[PDB]
Amino acid sequence: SMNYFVGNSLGVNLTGIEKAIINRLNLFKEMGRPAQCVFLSWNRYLYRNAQNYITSSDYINMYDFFQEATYLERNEPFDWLSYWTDECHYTLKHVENSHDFRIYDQERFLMYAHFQDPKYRILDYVNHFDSQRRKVKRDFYDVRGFLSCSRILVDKQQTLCEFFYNPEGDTKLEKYFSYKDGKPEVQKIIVYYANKQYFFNNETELGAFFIKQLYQHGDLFFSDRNVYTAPIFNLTPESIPVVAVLHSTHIKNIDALDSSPFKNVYKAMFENLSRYRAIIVSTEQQKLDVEKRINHTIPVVNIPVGYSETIDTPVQTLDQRSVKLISVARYSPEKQLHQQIELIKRLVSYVPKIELHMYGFGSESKKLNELIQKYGLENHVYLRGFLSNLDQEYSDAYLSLITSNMEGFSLALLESLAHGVPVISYDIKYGPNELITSDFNGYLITKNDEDALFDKVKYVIDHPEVQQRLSKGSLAKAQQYSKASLIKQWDQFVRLILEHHH
Amino acid sequence: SMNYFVGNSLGVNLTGIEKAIINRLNLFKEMGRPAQCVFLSWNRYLYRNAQNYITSSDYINMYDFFQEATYLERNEPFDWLSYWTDECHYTLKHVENSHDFRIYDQERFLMYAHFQDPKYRILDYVNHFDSQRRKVKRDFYDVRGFLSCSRILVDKQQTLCEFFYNPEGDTKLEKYFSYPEVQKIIVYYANKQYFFNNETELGAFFIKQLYQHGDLFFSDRNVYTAPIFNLTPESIPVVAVLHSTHIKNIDALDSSPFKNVYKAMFENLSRYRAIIVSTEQQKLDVEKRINHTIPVVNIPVGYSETIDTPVQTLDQRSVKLISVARYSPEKQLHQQIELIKRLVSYVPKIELHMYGFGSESKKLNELIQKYGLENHVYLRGFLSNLDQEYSDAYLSLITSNMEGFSLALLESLAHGVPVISYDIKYGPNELITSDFNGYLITKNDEDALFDKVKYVIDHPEVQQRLSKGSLAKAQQYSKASLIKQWDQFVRLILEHHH
């Protein structure tokens, strides 16, 4: 019996869903339930992107599966350069300011080679040219070393068809494209599997075929990238049990709970709820809203998307020479970080040793820097940019701020609570109510009530014994989200879902 | 050491060059010199055409070579319809008036299939369709049963590229097209990749792989093979064979341009060890024209086979004239009909049988009706076997304005049938000595034709003597005489090359 967490891919910078799937895999491994990540998209770098987080046997990519490259690792290094010069007698001309080379057979231009690294150890692509220097084919290499896909071009280097190979060079898939809105769109897929040919019109049908090949009685699927995975599961038999996992607000308009359309990404799942054994959400609050909206037609369960490590590091080493306020938030409009500048503008009068450090990045940085300069707050408000590790930043933090008009469950806030940093947040869906108990580990403020925000922040600055009480509540709150609590939640859920299904 | 006879392919109906090549192969095996026909064009029906003439071990096709399907025989039958329904669960809808099918997966139209046989044991081709019914790919099957080439289509079913497979389905060649001509050829050979701009370069590459020190090449289909040989090294010995007149107009020996099919050869004479022609008469013309730049050698393009049928069983009942000639303008066959219109008043039981086919059928047959000669002149059409037709043949007629070495003439002479021919190039002078085995007549002199034909009919003792000369002329062009000429030529060509 295998648990499959179905997403799309892994990027160089992991998304929220990608992290959620990897975290869930690590819990199932600790727990001792077999689990694997399932990836759908063709990604010839996926093995590189996965290397720092999961083992080869921890995932199945759909294209790797039909290419007979599932569980395959990196080949011995190959020096294409010596092969082309010593064995093939080609002339290699380096392209300056690149890891590229033009390949000639005497005066005849044959190929343009791109290497990923400047040591020329990772071949990326090789373009082929005809007698008129038309680019007719592109060979795309997997980071593991094998030729993954040849792309046949027409007209102005438009994609016509693609052939996907196993590591030995046998064709295992073919895709044919027609252009729509200036982009290639799949019109046909052929697959060589089980000594047969199979035919599909699109990647959703191919996806559905792939799910059916994985499944054995006892297995359980999680639909984690629902924009892609729900249409797939919708083309599979109800005998295959699947749980829909929501990673964001379920509706376009959070203030019209009953009547807002569902988010476009969840539309295919919500329009076929009877397909799904349950929905998982991150917060009790979202659970109650979704259950109400779908009239309890299937079970809805809240399971946090991550867990807290108990901290051994120095915690709360404060001094009264600096009052340090923190925000861990993308510099995006929804976070309303300008309001935190306005708060410090008002507060500095009453203690001028105040500092606000804002950890994140995005489009709003220019506007935030202007306001800082405008208010003369350059020795008080810092845009700290992105910091992968925040652990030293939490030790002297007095208080976290959230001024967002919308939220999701925050692993960032969970980590700052594990470090004993209390928080004052607008009362907005979803996540703040999950991680904040009024007067226990922080305060919830009426959305956009800057005056109430000021009064509450000032109250905690004026009452360090209240700060210390809230800090102890922050440690206690974080400990409810332990590795062991999450395991127990996951174990019980999987047990009950399978019993009901069978 | 191998002898290679390089043509292009084998049609349904073998051409002159194709028969010449197979005939020459037979001779070489008989004398104990290894010989193989070499073919160039992709032809997934080639094994079917070769079947009744040569074994698979007697030829190398260039596409077969790189597809690892040379010396490969027909695959054991395999039921496509039992695969598509029982193993694949597809649905087939027959198309009216065809050996075709539409393959559907449930309601989904996937493929258009096309067989040869009504036993549907020989797949021809399968068209693949996308979700919008666009024809994306055509699969072309070898008559031997393996999938040979997939063609990828774009736009208005235009050829973008083609993939050639070995029988196990490995890609061995790729071709890329712009508008449709080849701009690129990839071949997977000897554990690497070779690149060419066109099929002439692919041709030269193929020749270089075939050649081992001591082999000899013959260039038989020169319009294709000369340009190929022109891109191969001089260390590879090749002889050009001319199977026809070398110039567009035979009356301008000095000034006439070379035939288009022979240009690339004559414009690179030093590449060739020699030229072979069928007649001494042609040899002397070509030698003169090229200022003896390279040897020219006359070797007949066939031989007189041993007689296994009765000969010269004549009867006063009927005087049987024959013509063994394509029904073409150059054979000027109406002249023989005219000859009969004139003779029939002197020889009431004369008959003329004309064996052949071509454009002139209707004109000739109407001329017979016009002269009331339906009891006297027969358009016999094409006969595979003419052995029974010669036994009662009094004489053969050639009234052509132009000829080549005639296998037909050699056959009828081997049957003791003397011949009255116009004295035109080339072939008659080779095979006819006047007053020995027949008479040579001034071209288009129909009065002189009438005079000699009537003379031989009026004097049966003359016909008997010209018959004994016919058997003797045929004996001179025996298989063994032809063997000895080829044997010495090959040995002498190779001797001088090394």
Tab-separated table of C-alpha atoms in Angstrom, chain B residues 45 102 108 157 204 209 306 338 354 457-458:
chain	number	residue	atom	x	y	z
B	45	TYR	CA	8.334	-3.108	-52.509
B	102	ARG	CA	-10.772	3.088	-40.196
B	108	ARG	CA	-12.320	7.971	-31.326
B	157	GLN	CA	-0.189	17.494	-45.761
B	204	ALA	CA	28.772	8.217	-52.243
B	209	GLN	CA	31.139	1.488	-47.109
B	306	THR	CA	20.606	-23.520	-75.741
B	338	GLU	CA	2.705	-2.079	-96.373
B	354	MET	CA	4.153	-8.684	-84.665
B	457	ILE	CA	10.142	-16.504	-100.172
B	458	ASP	CA	10.552	-17.467	-103.891
